[PDB]
Amino acid sequence: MDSSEMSTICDKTLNPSFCLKFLNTKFASPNLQALAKTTLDSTQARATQTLKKLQSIIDGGVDPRSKLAYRSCVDEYESAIGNLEEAFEHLASGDGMGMNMKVSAALDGADTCLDDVKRLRSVDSSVVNNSKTIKNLCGIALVISNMLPRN
Amino acid sequence: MDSSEMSTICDKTLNPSFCLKFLNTKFASPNLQALAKTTLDSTQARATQTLKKLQSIIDGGVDPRSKLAYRSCVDEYESAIGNLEEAFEHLASGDGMGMNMKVSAALDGADTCLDDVKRLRSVDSSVVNNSKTIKNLCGIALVISNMLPRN
């Protein structure tokens, strides 16, 4: 919370100290774990969505050529999901090293689906955006995991 | 979130803009409603606890003199709870005016239990602290409600 507004508010109560301690406790600047935990939630969500949509596009039928490219993405994402899950376990264990390994793996995954899908004459934007989004997110996670305190 | 750390983090990703937009969205400085909403939650919680404990002290028996002072507090708090509930409805409706009225009412309530209980030779600290705490909290709410945009 803005140190400004916080003081602008407490400096009007019959007990600034209490008010300041309360607001600071309630709206504190995020810690590294929390930043990482949020980022992984977003990536896991995004990935899950992509996997549900890839399966969909495939289930409704598509030309032999696309169906192959997409089936590729499906396999890539199933791995990605798994890696992200493990990465979450590591973040929980405070293992930034382990987390970093895992997220990198997922990032590739996302990246690979993109490749396996670029040469298509037409692609579902949903899958492309999500894959790029997931790469951006994963990038953030990688940075954060590095700042996690090591052994 | 610290504009510093935020930049310290995004300035290491292959896409600062995205990362910055993400983190800023995810960990944004609280708005007035949110500050008020949190404060009321804390006060409502605190009040409810006090009421459950006042009833308790009374249910287990106490000398005629204390039982009267406490029964007083019970009535004061039952009103306080109600006022706080209404205040919550107002905050929801964006009625800072209405909210302010209601919280003031509760503040008194808290304050009154304190009076009705000071002349006792001995008091349950739990009830005293909670009442002072609730007054501090209510104070914050009063300030905030005033900054809520008016008609």
A59 contacts chain B (CB < 8 A):
no
Q: Which residue has the tokens 């909670």?
A: B130
Measured between alpha carbons, how far is B83 from B91 in angstroms, rounded to an integer?
12
Query: Which residues of B are less than 8 Å from A23 in CB distance?
Result: 35, 140
Number of domains in chain B: 1
Measured between alpha carbons, how far is A134 from A62 in angstroms, rounded to an integer?
25
Query: Which residues of A are less than 8 Å from B107 in CB distance?
Result: none
Tokens linked to A85: 């899950």
The distance from CA B83 to its chain's CA centroid, rounded to whole angstroms, is: 12
Measured between alpha carbons, how far is A68 from A73 in angstroms, rounded to an integer?
9
Q: What is the resolution of this structure in A?
A: 2.9
Tokens linked to B17: 């803009």
Query: Which residues of B are less than 8 Å from A131 in CB distance?
Result: none
Q: Which of A75, A127, A81 is nearest to A105 (CA)?
A: A81
Measured between alpha carbons, how far is B44 from B9 in angstroms, rounded to an integer?
38
Q: What's the domain range around A127?
A: 1-151
Q: Which residue has the tokens 């009374």?
A: B58
CB contact at 8 A, A44 and A134: no
CATH of the domain at A97: 1.20.140.40
Exposure letters B63-98 (e unless 16+ CB within 10 A, then b): eeebeebbebbbebbeebbebbebbbebbeeebbeb
Measured between alpha carbons, how far is A67 from A52 in angstroms, rounded to an integer?
15
Experimentally, the structure was elucidated by X-ray
